[PDB]
Scaffold this active site. Structure first.
Site, PDB file in Angstrom:
ATOM      1  N   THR F   1       0.852  -1.224   0.000  1.00 57.29           N
ATOM      2  CA  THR F   1       0.000   0.000   0.000  1.00 57.29           C
ATOM      3  C   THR F   1       0.870   1.250   0.000  1.00 57.29           C
ATOM      4  O   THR F   1       1.766   1.390   0.830  1.00 57.29           O
ATOM      5  CB  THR F   1      -0.937   0.047   1.226  1.00 57.29           C
ATOM      6  OG1 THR F   1      -1.849  -1.061   1.180  1.00 57.29           O
ATOM      7  CG2 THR F   1      -1.736   1.356   1.262  1.00 57.29           C
ATOM      8  N   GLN F   2       0.601   2.147  -0.943  1.00 60.28           N
ATOM      9  CA  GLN F   2       1.269   3.440  -0.995  1.00 60.28           C
ATOM     10  C   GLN F   2       0.252   4.520  -1.352  1.00 60.28           C
ATOM     11  O   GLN F   2      -0.954   4.271  -1.392  1.00 60.28           O
ATOM     12  CB  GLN F   2       2.418   3.455  -2.024  1.00 60.28           C
ATOM     13  CG  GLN F   2       2.893   2.104  -2.535  1.00 60.28           C
ATOM     14  CD  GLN F   2       2.024   1.576  -3.663  1.00 60.28           C
ATOM     15  OE1 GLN F   2       0.795   1.606  -3.578  1.00 60.28           O
ATOM     16  NE2 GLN F   2       2.659   1.106  -4.736  1.00 60.28           N
ATOM     17  N   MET F 107      -1.262  -6.644  -2.311  1.00 59.51           N
ATOM     18  CA  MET F 107      -1.530  -5.387  -1.597  1.00 59.51           C
ATOM     19  C   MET F 107      -0.436  -4.335  -1.817  1.00 59.51           C
ATOM     20  O   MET F 107      -0.152  -3.516  -0.940  1.00 59.51           O
ATOM     21  CB  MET F 107      -1.753  -5.649  -0.099  1.00 59.51           C
ATOM     22  CG  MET F 107      -2.978  -6.499   0.194  1.00 59.51           C
ATOM     23  SD  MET F 107      -4.512  -5.679  -0.296  1.00 59.51           S
ATOM     24  CE  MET F 107      -4.668  -4.463   1.013  1.00 59.51           C
TER      25      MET F 107
END
Ligand code: BO2
Ligand code: MG
Lengths: 244, 222, 231, 195, 235, 233, 212, 204, 240
Positions: F1-2, F107
């Site tokens: 996740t970013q 993810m």
């Protein structure tokens, strides 16, 4: 590849013997004799240092008799370096048991554990076995005073009196002759030294060529004391028994 | 925070006949209030006289169908070109779905075909793999609009025979392929009227002993 | 002699004996023929039985709708390699939506067999394969050897007595290459080719195994009464 | 589960444990035995999170039974309690800890003395004349502080235990459906079938 | 010494060829396939009279529709049977159906060549796998430690195999009944066995579509032995 | 996740009778800051495919390197690399679609929306979409971000269904694309005047146009607008 | 979901409802909440549909493997413990299961085990599981005896599910009856609640609150 | 919730003329509930004494751990461990659990057998050594103990005077803490004799 | 890790390492098993080359695997401990999961499986041990006696012997044991077991160990004097 150079340490002979175990036992038969004698009121451990020198620092030296815990000790016969590997493992096992159950480890359980480690090196891993035979002298509240021996095969047995190392055949005959069941520690001390004095390859048995230890209930009231004898104390017991 | 799931809308419908089965689905694909495509096929011929559709999150839907088609291929390789029966396909799909129990395929899956006695068969799945053979099932966005209509017009629920007044039920007479297609078309026309994610086109796949046939019909594009 | 104990050892003349012994296992295997035109590619295989009560060992394996092979030698090794091809054909389809080229399929088999010839502990594959297929550049025929060597050919044969069929194809080269849009005549030429390798025994209904792939023809295998037409 | 009590008298240890099992809304069972025999002269009662309790007890039981067979010898209650404590002390820093509290009642045949050990899920061990887990001790320790003696008989211990259970049945909100009582002494373990 | 996965100059794996010699020393097992069912029979060969012969388990159930007989180092067969049972049950779990006899056999044969320097050596046991499925009907397979399996109308493995196979060559035809097959296995077992054939040193079994795989009782086999003796004395 | 940092806005495209057209502006935004003014977001692959990318620019450059590497890898041991076994638009798309869905499943997504425009071997028009979630779809017109809301409506008036494709010429199609780019410049706060356009025709091949500008803009009517209601001056 | 099972003179009665819901939406009225593990074992299903279905058909594979390996029918104790030990491994992960494992062997007799996704495993005579379990308990506890006829026991189970089908919003559809004896289980039909309610009301004189 | 104040308890140590003293309370509780009044917190390995406050399971675990380690030390070294050396061993052992620490407040006390010099030391839960000349405090009533020690203490107290000072420091600190008390023990330590005294205190 | 294939086939189809493991069993002290109508007796030889032994603490030849099953052996003593430990662990594991103690057949099948595994695993040699496993299944009064060997094969026996001079005692048992009528009592079964060992043992003093196992976990080891009474009675009948 690498197969070419593999000795195959864990195989049977056509006769059903383990080559490396048999050859390790041959190695041990040249080591200094160690004797264990069990009495009603204690246990004696006696052992002969191998051809020493006058310049060896004896009072700080230890090659035969080792302390596993306050209740259990061992006499060594074979490669000293191999023995110290196993001794440190045995010291740890005893402490693991004490931490788990809050009781001192029973002698046999410690012996079985070390013997199982030796067995493993004869069945798997492709490594050489430990060239060591132990005499275990110990006490617990189940069986009281106990003597055991283990060898490179990982097989162990219990004894009233036993020898390992050099001249065991001659030593075992002498012990079998003079040993009695109602014997005491002071008498067992004398028997151990007399046996070494006759089986020794040296010219004469002296204090500087010996290691000695007793496990006695000769400790103030219901408890057990280990006594690793000092050089001067070995000299005195040699005079007392009338060997020097 | 990153959200790995999305909703592509759409609606699907499976009906099992006496010697046939249909699997229908609208061709509209959406995100939020936008149309992605007015014609994006959603019902697929997977071989062995089996049709499949995985409605909901299209990425997971395409992944699942792709993996099942793959399973059919390897079933032929591993078991001497044996025909994969509809019941066996259903059980296989359960394991595909449950394999991702803790990170699910966000889809409502329906398959249709013929059973080993030649009778029409429809199977229905939830996202995590629970399944059940059914005579009738709608799935997706407008499922709640369509299912009650099918309870009434396919299984004759709450219908009784005139003169008896609630005593004798309407008998469960079998429906022809022409009759089923009429009910499918009316179901989607009605769903299109009242559901914003349904429209554009209707594609029906019909399965019989002869094979898999296709029919397409226009739906309202607003 | 002293240099055949394992695959990791060259001989003084630069030979790999374990690989050569693996090559020998192919020569003991039953004959199989491969040939192609511009439109179609055909495999013909003589199946071998253990005795009269036994079945005839299958020789041809399907890898994809457009590709497959015939085997000669250790059958389990063919199962391992054909399984690998099935996976590689399948990876190409799933990831790139692309049917695997027959030439690239040969390159993958070569590299897989090679690793087994340079490392200690393992062994070479004990089987030879004839791969046919129809891709974007038309019909193809490959010959795989477990040394790693893969070769594209118009026609060939491997197994016991395969030299007879290979000579026939070498004569017929100009004729059978021109058999376009006629599957039955191309198979006839393949059946006539494998017949040059027969001794004592002849082609019966449960003995013969044929496979074909082409322009509008998926890889299909013919056994039993389906090949009685060609006997 | 809910209430588990223990009391060490002159010549025995008595453990009392509730019979109820409650799945949220309903009482699914009213005859549940919340205890396992670890060895002939050692009994362990338990209470905590569902599933974990039985899983832990049976795991300990299996280990002690294994020790007994290997050595042909029964471990002392003190030794068993130390083994159990270590397992819980190991457990508390695991991925998913055992959420189990236990009482260990045993008769040491060597010293000819009854022994009661209280251990919580963290691995907190204490030897006591009487003990409890959960909200039980809040009601019962005041009674035990008043009436208890080290020289009490087993019958006097059961009467003092009845007074504890009566207080619990009066002041606790939950209906725990009575208790199963078990006695541990020199002759082994037995259940009081009428209580 | 030399590699475990080494090829001989003739193009055969040394270890596989040596395991085949161990199988030749094993007790005889015979299988016959008919349109009414498949019959499996074995020689028990007890080493001493004090050995309770009913504990000798050389015929084994894999599933309800698949049975198995063994010959050679029978201890090696235990992990193969375990794998077969697991494969049969696992396929039923994944596909809600019975597994094809051929597919089961193929799964067992995949273990065969998984040896090197995986297990340290090939299996020293051959298997006769008999069963029924809807597609190919009644079937009999011979699974070797080479990883190869042949289908057979009839097959014998073990110490008396080549003598028994020659006998099966003459006797088998496509119209055999189940009763005829039972007697035929008993006849050929009696021929190649060292000791005299009876219900205690020989065991029969069959697989039918209706009843599935069944190991025969010693009382049931004893009657078939008596029926055999009379029909041989009849001419 | 970013989170996306440096970003690119709309990519728009449509089919016409003999091929496909695709376009995208040359801006790399850093939040509300219009940081980088010379960013090429249309990346050609061979002479038959153009990949248009929106969203995170660092991930775009990564994808650009993957495609560059894909061409290199396809040439290996391939005598027909510039002929029958050349990379097709369908091959390039499916590869990207695989990567996008794999990355979302770990993810750790490539924060992009991608349109693969091209012409196949048999002359068929190829136009398909894929994004950070691995979602894919095809349509006669396709657009990302703001383009989806503003460009598609305009482009769908030209090609409303499949049957309108043969009736649509390259001149009419390009005109519609260029007009859509103007509308996006009027209304998208993260757009620029400068853009690139690419045409892939089955007859005339790949035509890549750089340094195009939005022109013929209507602003004169602004002078008459005064205040927010009641103000007259 | 309402599922029950109880021991009695004639073996075990198992009764379940048929409804499946997603929120307030009725997803299915024709769900098979009883699993035929083998001719002697039944499992009930409550909680997550998939979890229950998957792991209980899996249980049947483990039971089949046991009797292939041990040449003997698996005990109800052993079968239930395989499932409880399995779900205990997954504890915390979010499985949702409430199940009864019901069977009859020689050594045990008729036996019921409640198995739970929190790891709970309980042997007992009567169990009710699901959202409508409390409603079923009322009817059971007031009418239960050991000396019930197979006919009367079957009706009590049927009636107890009906009670819960009426009051519990997340229960209904139809009633599936099973009767487990020394010679295996026996199916006793699907009973639509829409017809069963009016039938029971008329014949029994109950539900006087409702108008018919 | 806070692990260091679930069970409660206190330890204090002081130096005197040719002597040291270490003392602790006897309470173990579960928050408000008093469970045990015989939970001693001072242990000894040879002539080195260790007091431990904090989470009781860790108190027990660490005692068992240091008994383990000092027993191996003695077998290998052939001598008893000294206070200065043991202090370093405690610090090393606590810091190895830097990011998953034992929730404890150890206190070392003893006299070096060779030099005869009195020695005390304290630690935080992860190994930091506080080697004070005068006194060390630990536990839930550490603030109270600091106040008592800082006012009552004077250097070079005789063993029997030091007993009175440390006892009054503990008792009055404990009585101002809800989670401490329920009895107390005081060790007076000289070079070759150690006296242990249980104190009479209020049992609430 | 050490992966070397030690157990391999030879040209004549033999696995020599497994066969040499049997030679180690041939060297081991004699062990015998006899099952009566309602009991099983395990007899074991103690070689009298070792005196000055402490018989209290010396490892006994018969080992309890569970309260209802026992295991004796012939061969390498150290190897036997490993099998016994594994068996004891599996016995407790079976009770834990199946909620029922192991059958004698099951425990045998496990020990036999371990032995087999060591004949086709890399880097390990086979166990130089054959075992006699005896006992009674839970809630069953039928006696059980099984044998295992290094190869991994196992089987049930009415009576059996293993170890040195086992050929002689098997000869004795084959003529003296009747299947139609086995030793009806404990006395008759122990007597037949001591008789069989007296064919091989030497002196009937501390050289014979006897262990009687009866149904429902009733296991007891006979003392020196109790065995000595059997030795006395056998020879007094023989003087005729
Ligand atoms: B029952 O209520 O537990 C019922 C039985 C299930 C095994 C079919 N469960 C459900 O209907 C659940 C929802 C639920 C309701 C009440 C309590 C707990 C759970 N439904 C599902 O699991 C489900 C599955 N697929 C689709 C829809 N619903
Ligand atoms: Mg609409």
């Amino acid at each position: 590849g690498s197969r070419r150079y593999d000795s195959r340490t864990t195989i049977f002979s056509p006769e059903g013997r383990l080559y490396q175990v048999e050859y390790a036992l041959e190695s041990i038969s040249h080591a200094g004799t160690a004797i264990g004698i069990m009495a009603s009121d204690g246990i004696v451990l006696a052992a002969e240092r191998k051809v020493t020198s006058t310049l060896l620092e004896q009072d700080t030296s230890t090659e035969k008799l080792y302390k596993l815990n306050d209740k259990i000790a061992v006499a060594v016969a074979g490669l000293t370096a191999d023995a110290e590997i196993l001794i440190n493992t045995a010291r740890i096992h005893a402490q693991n048991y004490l931490k788990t159950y809050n009781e001192d480890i029973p002698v046999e359980i410690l012996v079985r554990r070390l013997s199982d480690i030796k067995q493993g090196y004869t069945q798997h891993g492709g490594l050489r076995p430990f060239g060591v035979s132990f005499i275990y002298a110990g006490y617990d509240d189940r069986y009281g005073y106990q003597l055991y021996t283990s060898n490179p095969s990982g097989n162990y047995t219990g004894w009233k009196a036993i020898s390992v190392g050099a001249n065991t055949s001659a030593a075992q005959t002498l012990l079998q002759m003079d040993y009695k069941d109602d014997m005491k520690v002071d008498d067992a001390i004398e028997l151990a030294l007399k046996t070494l004095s006759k089986t020794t390859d040296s010219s004469a048995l002296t204090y500087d060529r010996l290691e000695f230890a007793t496990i006695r209930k000769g400790a103030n009231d219901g408890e057990v004391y280990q006594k690793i004898f000092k050089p001067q104390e070995i000299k005195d017991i040699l005079v007392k028994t009338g060997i020097t | 925070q990153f959200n790995p799931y999305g909703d592509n809308g759409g609606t699907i419908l499976g009906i099992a006949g006496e010697d046939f089965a249909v699997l229908a689905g609208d061709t509209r694909n959406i995100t939020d209030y936008s149309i992605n495509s007015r014609y994006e096929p959603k019902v697929f011929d997977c071989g062995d006289n089996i049709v499949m559709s995985a409605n909901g999150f299209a990425a997971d839907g395409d992944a699942l169908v792709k993996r099942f088609k793959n399973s059919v291929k390897w079933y032929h390789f591993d078991h001497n070109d044996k025909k994969l029966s509809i019941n066996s396909a259903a059980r296989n799909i359960q394991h595909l779905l449950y394999g991702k129990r803790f990170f699910p395929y966000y889809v409502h899956t329906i398959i249709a075909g013929l059973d080993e006695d030649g009778k029409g068969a429809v199977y229905s799945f939830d996202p995590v793999g629970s399944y059940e053979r059914e005579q009738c099932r709608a799935g997706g966005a407008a499922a709640s609009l369509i299912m009650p209509f099918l309870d009434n017009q396919v299984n004759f629920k709450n219908q009784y025979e005139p003169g008896t007044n609630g005593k004798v039920k309407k008998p469960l007479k079998y429906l022809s392929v022409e009759e089923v297609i009429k009910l499918v078309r009316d179901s989607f026309t009605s769903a299109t009227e009242r559901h914003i994610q349904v429209g554009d086109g209707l594609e029906i796949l019909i399965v019989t002993k002869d094979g898999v046939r296709k029919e397409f019909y226009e739906l309202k594009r607003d | 002699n002293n240099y055949d104990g394992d695959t990791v050892t060259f001989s003084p003349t630069g030979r790999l004996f374990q690989v050569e012994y693996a090559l020998e296992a192919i020569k003991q295997g039953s004959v199989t023929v491969g040939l192609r035109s511009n439109t179609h590619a055909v495999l013909v295989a003589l199946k071998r039985n253990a005795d009269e009560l036994s079945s005839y060992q299958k020789k041809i394996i399907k890898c994809d709708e457009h590709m497959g092979l015939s085997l000669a030698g250790l059958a389990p090794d063919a199962r391992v390699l054909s399984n690998y091809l099935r996976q590689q054909c399948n990876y190409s389809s799933l990831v790139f939506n692309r049917k695997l080229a027959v030439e690239r399929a040969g390159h993958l088999l070569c590299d897989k067999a090679q690793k087994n010839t340079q490392s200690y502990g393992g062994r070479p594959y004990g089987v030879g394969l004839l791969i046919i297929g129809y891709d974007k550049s038309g019909a193809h025929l490959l010959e795989f050897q477990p040394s790693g060597n893969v070769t594209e050919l118009y026609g060939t044969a491997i197994g016991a007595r395969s030299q007879g069929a290979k000579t026939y194809l070498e004569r017929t080269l100009d004729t059978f290459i021109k058999i376009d849009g006629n599957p039955d005549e191309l198979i006839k030429a393949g059946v006539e080719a494998i017949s040059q390798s027969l001794r004592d025994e002849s082609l019966t209904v449960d003995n013969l195994s044929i496979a074909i792939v082409g322009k509008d023809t998926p890889f299909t295998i013919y056994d039993g009464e389906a090949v009685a037409k060609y006997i | 589960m809910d209430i588990i009590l223990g009391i060490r008298v002159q010549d025995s240890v008595i453990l009392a444990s509730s019979k109820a099992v409650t799945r949220g809304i309903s009482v699914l069972k009213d005859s549940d035995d919340k205890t396992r025999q670890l060895s002939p002269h050692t009994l362990m009662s338990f209470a905590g999170e569902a599933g974990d309790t039985v899983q832990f007890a049976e795991y300990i039981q299996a280990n002690i039974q294994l020790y007994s067979i290997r050595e042909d010898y029964e471990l002392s209650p003190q030794a068993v309690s130390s083994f159990v404590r270590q397992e819980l002390a190991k457990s508390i820093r695991s991925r998913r800890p055992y959420q189990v509290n236990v009482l260990i009642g045993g008769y040491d045949k060597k010293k000819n003395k009854p022994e009661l050990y209280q251990i919580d899920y963290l691995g907190t061990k204490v030897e006591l004349p009487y003990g409890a887990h959960g909200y039980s001790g809040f009601y019962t320790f005041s009674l035990l502080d008043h009436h208890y003696r080290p020289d009490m008989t087993t019958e006097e211990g059961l009467d003092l235990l009845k007074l504890c259970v009566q207080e619990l049945e009066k002041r606790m909100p939950m209906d725990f459906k009575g208790v199963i009582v078990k006695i541990v002494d020199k002759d082994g373990i037995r259940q009081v079938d009428d209580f | 010494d030399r590699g475990v996965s080494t090829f001989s100059p003739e193009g055969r794996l040394f270890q596989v060829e040596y395991s085949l010699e161990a199988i030749k020393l094993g007790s005889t097992a015979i299988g016959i396939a008919t349109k009414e069912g498949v019959v499996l029979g074995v020689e028990k060969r007890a080493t001493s009279p004090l050995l309770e012969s009913d504990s000798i388990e050389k015929i084994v159930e894999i599933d309800r529709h698949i049975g198995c007989a063994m010959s050679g180092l029978t201890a090696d067969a235990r992990s193969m049977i375990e794998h077969a049972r697991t494969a049969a049950v696992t396929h039923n779990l994944y596909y809600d159906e019975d597994i094809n006899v051929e597919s089961l056999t193929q799964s067992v044969c995949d273990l065969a060549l998984r040896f090197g320097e995986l297990m340290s050596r090939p299996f020293g046991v051959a298997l006769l796998i008999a069963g029924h499925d809807a597609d190919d009907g009644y079937q009999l397979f011979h699974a070797e430690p080479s990883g190869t399996f042949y289908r057979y109308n009839a097959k014998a493995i073990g110490s008396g195999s080549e003598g028994a196979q020659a006998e099966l060559l003459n006797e088998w035809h496509s119209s055999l009944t189940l009763k005829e097959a039972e007697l035929l296995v008993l006849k050929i077992l009696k021929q190649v066995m060292e000791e005299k054939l009876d219900e205690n040193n020989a065991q029969l079994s069959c697989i039918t579509k209706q009843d599935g795989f069944k190991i025969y009782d010693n009382e049931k086999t004893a009657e078939l032995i008596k029926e055999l003796k009379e029909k041989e004395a009849a001419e | 996740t970013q989170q996306p940092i440096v970003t690119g806005t709309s990519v728009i495209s449509m089919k016409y009778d003999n091929g496909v057209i695709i376009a995208a502006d040359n801006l790399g935004s850093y939040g509300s800051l219009l940081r980088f003014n010379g960013v090429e977001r249309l990346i050609p692959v061979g002479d038959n495919t153009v990949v248009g990318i929106s969203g995170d620019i660092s991930d775009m450059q990564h994808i650009e390197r993957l495609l560059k590497d894909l061409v290199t890898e396809n040439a290996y041991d391939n005598p027909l690399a510039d002929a029958e076994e050349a990379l097709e638009p369908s091959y390039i798309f499916e590869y990207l679609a695989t990567v996008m869905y794999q990355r979302r499943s770990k993810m750790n997504p490539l924060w992009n929306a991608i349109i693969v425009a091209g012409v196949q071997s048999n002359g068929d028009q190829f136009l398909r979409y894929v994004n950070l979630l691995g979602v894919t779809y095809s349509s006669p017109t396709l657009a990302t971000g703001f383009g989806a809301h503003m460009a598609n409506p305009l482009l769908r008036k030209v090609v409303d269904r499949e049957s309108d494709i043969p009736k649509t010429t390259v001149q009419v199609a390009e005109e519609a694309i260029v007009n859509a780019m103007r509308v996006l410049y009027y209304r998208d706060a993260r757009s620029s005047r400068n853009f690139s356009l690419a045409i892939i025709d089955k007859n005339t091949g790949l035509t890549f146009k750089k340094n195009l500008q939005v022109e013929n803009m209507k602003w004169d009517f602004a002078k008459d607008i005064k205040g927010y209601g009641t103000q007259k001056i | 979901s309402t599922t029950l099972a109880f021991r009695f003179q004639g073996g075990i009665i198992v009764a379940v409802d048929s409804r499946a819901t997603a929120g307030n939406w009725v997803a299915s009225q024709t769900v098979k909440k009883v699993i035929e593990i083998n001719p002697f074992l039944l499992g009930t299903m409550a909680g997550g549909a998939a979890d229950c279905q998957f792991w209980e058909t899996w249980l049947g594979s483990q039971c089949r493997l046991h009797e292939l390996r041990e040449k003997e029918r698996i005990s109800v104790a052993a079968a239930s413990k395989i499932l409880s030990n399995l779900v205990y491994q997954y504890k915390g992960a979010g499985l949702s299961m409430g199940t009864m494992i019901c069977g009859y062997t020689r050594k045990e007799g008729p036996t019921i085990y409640y198995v739970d996704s929190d790891g709970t495993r309980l042997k007992g005579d009567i169990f009710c599981v699901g959202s409508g379990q409390t409603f079923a308990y009322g009817v059971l506890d007031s009418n239960y005896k050991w000396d019930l006829s197979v006919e009367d026991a079957l009706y009590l189970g049927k009636r107890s599910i009906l009670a819960a089908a009426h009051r519990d919003a997340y229960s209904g559809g139809s009633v599936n009856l099973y009767h487990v004896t020394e010679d295996g289980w026996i199916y006793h039909g699907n009973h639509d609640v829409g017809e069963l309610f009016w039938k029971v009301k008329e014949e029994e004189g109950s539900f006087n609150n409702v108008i018919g | 919730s806070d692990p260091s104040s679930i069970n409660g308890g206190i330890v204090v140590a002081m130096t005197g003329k040719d002597c040291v003293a270490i003392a602790c309370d006897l309470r173990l509780g579960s928050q408000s509930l008093g469970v045990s009044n015989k939970f001693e917190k001072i242990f000894h390995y040879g002539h080195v004494f260790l007091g431990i406050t904090g989470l009781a399971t860790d108190v027990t675990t660490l005692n068992e751990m240091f008994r383990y380690k000092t027993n191996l030390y003695k077998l290998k070294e052939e001598r008893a461990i000294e206070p200065e050396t043991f202090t370093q061993l405690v610090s090393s052992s606590l810091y190895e659990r830097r990011f998953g620490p034992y929730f404890v407040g150890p206190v070392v006390a003893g006299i070096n057998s060779k030099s005869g010099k009195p020695f005390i030391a304290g630690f935080d839960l992860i190994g930091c050594i506080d080697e004070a000349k005068d006194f060390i405090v630990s536990g839930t009533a550490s603030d109270q103990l600091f106040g008592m020690c800082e006012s009552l203490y004077e250097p070079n107290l005789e063993p029997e005077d030091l007993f009175e000072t440390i006892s009054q420091a503990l008792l009055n600190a404990a009585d101002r803490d809800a989670l401490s008390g329920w009895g107390a023990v005081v060790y007076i330590i000289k070079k070759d004799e150690v006296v242990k005294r249980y104190l009479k205190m209020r049992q609430d | 890790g050490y992966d070397r294939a030690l157990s391999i086939f030879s040209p004549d189809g033999h696995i020599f390492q497994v066969e040499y493991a049997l030679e180690a069993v041939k060297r081991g002290t004699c062990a015998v098993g006899v099952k009566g109508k309602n009991c099983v007796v395990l007899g074991c030889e103690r070689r009298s080359t070792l005196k000055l032994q402490d018989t209290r603490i010396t490892p006994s030849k018969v080992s309890k695997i569970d309260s209802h099953v026992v295991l004796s052996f012939s061969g390498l003593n150290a190897d036997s401990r490993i099998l016994i430990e594994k068996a004891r662990v599996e016995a407790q594991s079976h009770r834990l999961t199946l909620e029922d103690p192991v059958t004698v057949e099951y425990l045998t099948r496990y020990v036999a499986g371990v032995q087999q595994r060591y004949t086709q695993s890399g880097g390990v040699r086979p166990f130089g041990v054959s075992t006699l496993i005896a006992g009674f299944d839970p809630r069953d009064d039928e006696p059980k006696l099984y044998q295992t060997e290094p190869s991994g094969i196992y089987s049930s026996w009415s009576a059996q012997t293993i170890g040195r001079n086992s050929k002689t005692v098997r000869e004795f048992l084959e003529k003296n044991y009747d299947r139609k009528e086995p030793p009806a009592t404990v006395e008759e079964c122990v007597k037949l077991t001591v008789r069989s060992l007296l064919e091989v043992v030497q002196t009937g003093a501390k050289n014979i160990e006897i262990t009687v196992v009866k149904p429902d976990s009733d296991i007891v080891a006979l003392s020196s004097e109790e065995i000595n009474q059997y030795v006395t009675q056998i020879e007094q009948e023989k003087q005729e």
